[PDB]
Write a protein that holds these residues in place. Structure first.
Motif, PDB file in Angstrom:
ATOM      1  N   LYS A  12       0.855  -1.172   0.000  1.00 26.02           N
ATOM      2  CA  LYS A  12       0.000   0.000   0.000  1.00 26.02           C
ATOM      3  C   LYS A  12       0.895   1.227   0.000  1.00 26.02           C
ATOM      4  CE  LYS A  12      -4.159   1.746   2.068  1.00 26.02           C
ATOM      5  NZ  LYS A  12      -5.328   1.139   2.765  1.00 26.02           N
ATOM      6  N   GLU A  13       0.456   2.265  -0.706  1.00 29.90           N
ATOM      7  CA  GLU A  13       1.315   3.434  -0.890  1.00 29.90           C
ATOM      8  C   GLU A  13       0.488   4.700  -1.115  1.00 29.90           C
ATOM      9  OE1 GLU A  13       2.002   0.450  -2.842  1.00 29.90           O
ATOM     10  OE2 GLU A  13       0.351   0.954  -4.192  1.00 29.90           O
ATOM     11  N   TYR A  14       0.948   5.793  -0.522  1.00 32.11           N
ATOM     12  CA  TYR A  14       0.344   7.108  -0.678  1.00 32.11           C
ATOM     13  C   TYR A  14       1.304   8.214  -0.255  1.00 32.11           C
ATOM     14  CZ  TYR A  14      -0.714   6.134   4.264  1.00 32.11           C
ATOM     15  OH  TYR A  14      -0.620   5.794   5.616  1.00 32.11           O
ATOM     16  N   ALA A  15       1.062   9.438  -0.716  1.00 31.29           N
ATOM     17  CA  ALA A  15       1.900  10.557  -0.338  1.00 31.29           C
ATOM     18  C   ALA A  15       1.690  10.896   1.129  1.00 31.29           C
ATOM     19  CB  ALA A  15       1.632  11.779  -1.204  1.00 31.29           C
ATOM     20  N   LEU A  16       2.789  11.049   1.870  1.00 36.98           N
ATOM     21  CA  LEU A  16       2.702  11.457   3.278  1.00 36.98           C
ATOM     22  C   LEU A  16       3.102  12.907   3.514  1.00 36.98           C
ATOM     23  CD1 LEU A  16       1.963  10.510   6.057  1.00 36.98           C
ATOM     24  CD2 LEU A  16       4.350   9.809   6.411  1.00 36.98           C
ATOM     25  N   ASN A  79      -2.068   1.914  14.974  1.00 38.99           N
ATOM     26  CA  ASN A  79      -2.611   1.928  13.624  1.00 38.99           C
ATOM     27  C   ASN A  79      -1.617   1.597  12.510  1.00 38.99           C
ATOM     28  OD1 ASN A  79      -1.439   4.374  12.630  1.00 38.99           O
ATOM     29  ND2 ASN A  79      -3.094   5.609  13.552  1.00 38.99           N
ATOM     30  N   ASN A  80      -0.331   1.602  12.829  1.00 41.29           N
ATOM     31  CA  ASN A  80       0.726   1.145  11.911  1.00 41.29           C
ATOM     32  C   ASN A  80       0.832   1.945  10.599  1.00 41.29           C
ATOM     33  OD1 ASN A  80       1.490  -0.979  13.710  1.00 41.29           O
ATOM     34  ND2 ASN A  80      -0.304  -2.137  13.041  1.00 41.29           N
ATOM     35  N   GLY A  81       0.278   3.148  10.593  1.00 37.45           N
ATOM     36  CA  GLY A  81       0.299   4.008   9.430  1.00 37.45           C
ATOM     37  C   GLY A  81      -0.405   3.409   8.233  1.00 37.45           C
ATOM     38  N   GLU A  82      -1.474   2.663   8.477  1.00 34.47           N
ATOM     39  CA  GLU A  82      -2.135   1.927   7.392  1.00 34.47           C
ATOM     40  C   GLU A  82      -2.719   2.849   6.323  1.00 34.47           C
ATOM     41  OE1 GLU A  82      -5.320  -0.568   8.690  1.00 34.47           O
ATOM     42  OE2 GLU A  82      -5.468  -1.620   6.763  1.00 34.47           O
ATOM     43  N   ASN A  83      -3.450   3.873   6.750  1.00 33.67           N
ATOM     44  CA  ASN A  83      -4.161   4.763   5.828  1.00 33.67           C
ATOM     45  C   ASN A  83      -3.766   6.221   6.047  1.00 33.67           C
ATOM     46  OD1 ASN A  83      -5.974   2.688   4.740  1.00 33.67           O
ATOM     47  ND2 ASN A  83      -6.822   2.661   6.809  1.00 33.67           N
ATOM     48  N   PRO A  84      -3.982   7.087   5.055  1.00 29.65           N
ATOM     49  CA  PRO A  84      -3.650   8.515   5.247  1.00 29.65           C
ATOM     50  C   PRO A  84      -4.232   9.170   6.508  1.00 29.65           C
ATOM     51  CG  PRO A  84      -4.173   8.120   2.960  1.00 29.65           C
ATOM     52  CD  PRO A  84      -4.413   6.812   3.671  1.00 29.65           C
ATOM     53  N   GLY A 348       7.833  -0.414   6.480  1.00 27.89           N
ATOM     54  CA  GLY A 348       7.365   0.923   6.168  1.00 27.89           C
ATOM     55  C   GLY A 348       8.525   1.707   5.600  1.00 27.89           C
ATOM     56  N   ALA A 349       8.347   2.306   4.423  1.00 27.92           N
ATOM     57  CA  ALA A 349       9.418   3.066   3.778  1.00 27.92           C
ATOM     58  C   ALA A 349       8.933   4.433   3.340  1.00 27.92           C
ATOM     59  CB  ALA A 349       9.965   2.316   2.570  1.00 27.92           C
ATOM     60  N   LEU A 350       9.730   5.442   3.610  1.00 30.62           N
ATOM     61  CA  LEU A 350       9.549   6.772   3.028  1.00 30.62           C
ATOM     62  C   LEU A 350      10.451   6.858   1.827  1.00 30.62           C
ATOM     63  CD1 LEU A 350       9.645   9.060   6.220  1.00 30.62           C
ATOM     64  CD2 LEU A 350       7.627   8.481   4.866  1.00 30.62           C
ATOM     65  N   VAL A 351       9.906   7.370   0.718  1.00 30.44           N
ATOM     66  CA  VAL A 351      10.690   7.500  -0.515  1.00 30.44           C
ATOM     67  C   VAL A 351      10.415   8.858  -1.135  1.00 30.44           C
ATOM     68  CG1 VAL A 351      11.225   6.477  -2.748  1.00 30.44           C
ATOM     69  CG2 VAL A 351      10.425   5.001  -0.888  1.00 30.44           C
ATOM     70  N   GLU A 352      11.481   9.565  -1.498  1.00 30.84           N
ATOM     71  CA  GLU A 352      11.350  10.846  -2.197  1.00 30.84           C
ATOM     72  C   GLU A 352      10.748  10.689  -3.582  1.00 30.84           C
ATOM     73  OE1 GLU A 352      15.361  12.424  -2.306  1.00 30.84           O
ATOM     74  OE2 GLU A 352      14.933  13.722  -0.547  1.00 30.84           O
ATOM     75  N   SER A 353      10.040  11.742  -3.989  1.00 33.42           N
ATOM     76  CA  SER A 353       9.515  11.857  -5.356  1.00 33.42           C
ATOM     77  C   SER A 353       9.673  13.299  -5.853  1.00 33.42           C
ATOM     78  CB  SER A 353       8.064  11.397  -5.372  1.00 33.42           C
ATOM     79  OG  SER A 353       7.568  11.261  -6.693  1.00 33.42           O
ATOM     80  N   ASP A 354       9.803  13.446  -7.179  1.00 34.71           N
ATOM     81  CA  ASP A 354      10.177  14.728  -7.793  1.00 34.71           C
ATOM     82  C   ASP A 354       9.182  15.035  -8.941  1.00 34.71           C
ATOM     83  OD1 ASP A 354      11.427  16.922  -8.996  1.00 34.71           O
ATOM     84  OD2 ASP A 354      13.416  16.046  -9.124  1.00 34.71           O
ATOM     85  N   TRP A 370       4.883   7.358   1.372  1.00 31.11           N
ATOM     86  CA  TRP A 370       4.907   6.331   2.410  1.00 31.11           C
ATOM     87  C   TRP A 370       4.381   5.043   1.815  1.00 31.11           C
ATOM     88  CZ3 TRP A 370       6.627   4.439   6.869  1.00 31.11           C
ATOM     89  CH2 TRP A 370       5.843   3.645   7.663  1.00 31.11           C
ATOM     90  N   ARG A 371       5.238   4.037   1.825  1.00 30.09           N
ATOM     91  CA  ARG A 371       4.953   2.714   1.346  1.00 30.09           C
ATOM     92  C   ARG A 371       4.960   1.740   2.514  1.00 30.09           C
ATOM     93  NH1 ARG A 371       5.284   1.428  -3.836  1.00 30.09           N
ATOM     94  NH2 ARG A 371       5.912   3.104  -5.288  1.00 30.09           N
ATOM     95  N   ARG A 372       4.054   0.776   2.444  1.00 33.89           N
ATOM     96  CA  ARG A 372       4.165  -0.399   3.287  1.00 33.89           C
ATOM     97  C   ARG A 372       4.094  -1.626   2.409  1.00 33.89           C
ATOM     98  NH1 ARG A 372       1.106  -1.271   8.228  1.00 33.89           N
ATOM     99  NH2 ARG A 372      -0.648  -1.533   6.755  1.00 33.89           N
ATOM    100  N   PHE A 373       4.870  -2.628   2.767  1.00 34.99           N
ATOM    101  CA  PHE A 373       4.829  -3.892   2.086  1.00 34.99           C
ATOM    102  C   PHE A 373       5.346  -4.988   3.027  1.00 34.99           C
ATOM    103  CE2 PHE A 373       8.326  -1.202   0.771  1.00 34.99           C
ATOM    104  CZ  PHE A 373       9.443  -1.917   1.165  1.00 34.99           C
ATOM    105  N   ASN A 374       4.944  -6.225   2.759  1.00 30.33           N
ATOM    106  CA  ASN A 374       5.451  -7.362   3.519  1.00 30.33           C
ATOM    107  C   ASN A 374       6.607  -8.043   2.794  1.00 30.33           C
ATOM    108  OD1 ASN A 374       3.920  -8.729   1.543  1.00 30.33           O
ATOM    109  ND2 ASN A 374       2.714  -9.892   3.045  1.00 30.33           N
ATOM    110  N   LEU A 375       7.262  -8.976   3.474  1.00 26.98           N
ATOM    111  CA  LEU A 375       8.377  -9.698   2.868  1.00 26.98           C
ATOM    112  C   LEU A 375       7.945 -10.452   1.609  1.00 26.98           C
ATOM    113  CD1 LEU A 375       9.960 -11.218   6.073  1.00 26.98           C
ATOM    114  CD2 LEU A 375      10.994  -9.398   4.687  1.00 26.98           C
ATOM    115  N   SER A 376       6.738 -11.006   1.627  1.00 24.08           N
ATOM    116  CA  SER A 376       6.210 -11.753   0.484  1.00 24.08           C
ATOM    117  C   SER A 376       6.217 -10.903  -0.780  1.00 24.08           C
ATOM    118  CB  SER A 376       4.775 -12.234   0.765  1.00 24.08           C
ATOM    119  OG  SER A 376       4.231 -12.870  -0.378  1.00 24.08           O
TER     120      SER A 376
END
Ligand SMILES: [Ca+2]
Length: 384
Positions: A12-16, A79-84, A348-354, A370-376
């Protein structure tokens, strides 16, 4: 086989941190907004609350000028930062004056969160000769007290709700005579033996003592980068995995608190001279280290997350390209990143965008995803 790979994939991913050009841009309660957000750092506290830090660059995307260190927390520890809507509105750690406050580099120590950061006087820049919004030209960062890069430390003992007035530690935690400097950016770590290690330019910064009552010293390194990452690998050793000076590949060294061995390029990890992030995911079987950077020798838009199962993290897998889970309406993703483990067994990962509107020019708006993903999700990537 990695047993986590049999699980259903999750992402799951969205702008934070939403730049000034975006709908619902992030602003402080004072009404102060930001042209760009860059330089992410993220940590999970011992309550489960997530703290996300960034540089709020007020007027343009440049590394100098009026820049504030800002943050958001998840509204609850659970809440684990699930949703905006799980995130609080933007707050400020420090923004005083026209100065640059940045390079957030946090580490969690029991019930205390330590945040190291860099600072320079608003009249100075790395190269000098740069035009500020009022038309004045910066002086080049130098070795004088006013003109050098400073290193500050702030702390929170209330789960990131409030922060102490930053304390200038330059005189003890930066080498005398040094001009430019950086800490992190990204994160420090707490070792299995309880010491804290923060990566910085040409050195590690080491915290010792009881939890929450640390004193700090420098571990000077030979051949280290300016923007480093630190990791305790499953074998118990320390590893610095650093942004290279020249474009090409990550620069890596291994050792202990008694000293690191030589840095050498790691040909398995291409890098375009950009910051990366690293995370010790787990120490039980199988032990995993997660690495994220732009997997390219010349561009920042090839973001890749990878796993190593090696005791010394010698080799990482192909992993997965973040473009496999693309996000619309945030510009071109890629750049600096930071990772944490969440309470619900996600990364949970923060990633820059331009947005790239002015190309490489100062007017291009920058935001953070802000991205979340599992090992799978990583394990079952098509090229993995
Ligand atoms: Ca400022």
């Amino acid at each position: 086989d990695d047993p986590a790979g049999k699980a259903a994939q999750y992402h799951k991913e969205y702008a934070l941190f939403r730049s000034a050009n975006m709908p619902s841009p992030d602003k402080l309660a004072t009404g102060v907004g930001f042209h760009s957000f860059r330089i992410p750092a993220v940590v999970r506290t011992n309550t489960g609350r997530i703290l996300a830090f960034a540089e709020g660059r007020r007027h343009n995307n440049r590394d100098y000028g009026d820049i504030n260190l800002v943050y958001k927390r998840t509204k609850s520890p659970t809440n684990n930062g699930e949703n905006p809507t799980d995130w609080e509105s933007l707050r400020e750690v420090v923004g005083t004056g026209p100065h640059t406050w940045g390079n957030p580099t946090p580490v969690v120590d029991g019930n205390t969160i330590y945040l190291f950061l860099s600072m320079n006087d608003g009249a100075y820049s790395q190269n000098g000769g740069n035009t500020l919004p009022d038309g004045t030209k910066t002086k080049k960062i130098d070795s004088t007290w006013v003109g050098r890069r400073h290193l500050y430390l702030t702390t929170s003992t209330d789960d990131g709700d409030t922060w102490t007035k930053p304390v200038d530690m330059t005189k003890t935690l930066t080498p005398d005579g040094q001009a430019w400097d950086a800490v992190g950016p990204g994160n420090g770590i707490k070792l299995s033996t309880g010491e804290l290690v923060i990566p910085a330019q040409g050195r590690n910064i080491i915290g010792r003592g009881p939890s929450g009552n640390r004193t700090w010293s420098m571990q000077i390194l030979k051949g280290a980068g300016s923007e480093g990452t630190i990791c305790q690998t499953p074998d118990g050793k320390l590893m610095r995995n650093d942004r290279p000076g020249p474009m090409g590949h990550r620069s890596v060294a291994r050792g202990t608190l008694a000293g690191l061995g030589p840095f050498a390029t790691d040909n398995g990890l291409p890098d375009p001279a950009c910051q990366g992030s690293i995370l010790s995911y787990n120490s039980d079987e199988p032990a995993r280290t997660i690495f994220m950077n732009s997997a390219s020798t010349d561009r920042r838009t090839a973001m890749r997350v990878r796993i190593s199962y090696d005791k010394d993290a010698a080799k990482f897998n192909f992993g997965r390209e973040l473009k496999d889970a693309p996000l619309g309406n945030v510009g071109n993703e890629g750049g600096y990143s930071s990772m944490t483990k969440t309470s619900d067994y996600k990364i949970g990962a923060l990633v820059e965008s331009d947005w790239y509107e002015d190309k490489g020019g100062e007017k291009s708006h920058r935001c953070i995803i802000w991205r979340r993903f599992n090992l799978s999700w990583i394990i079952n990537g098509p090229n993995n």
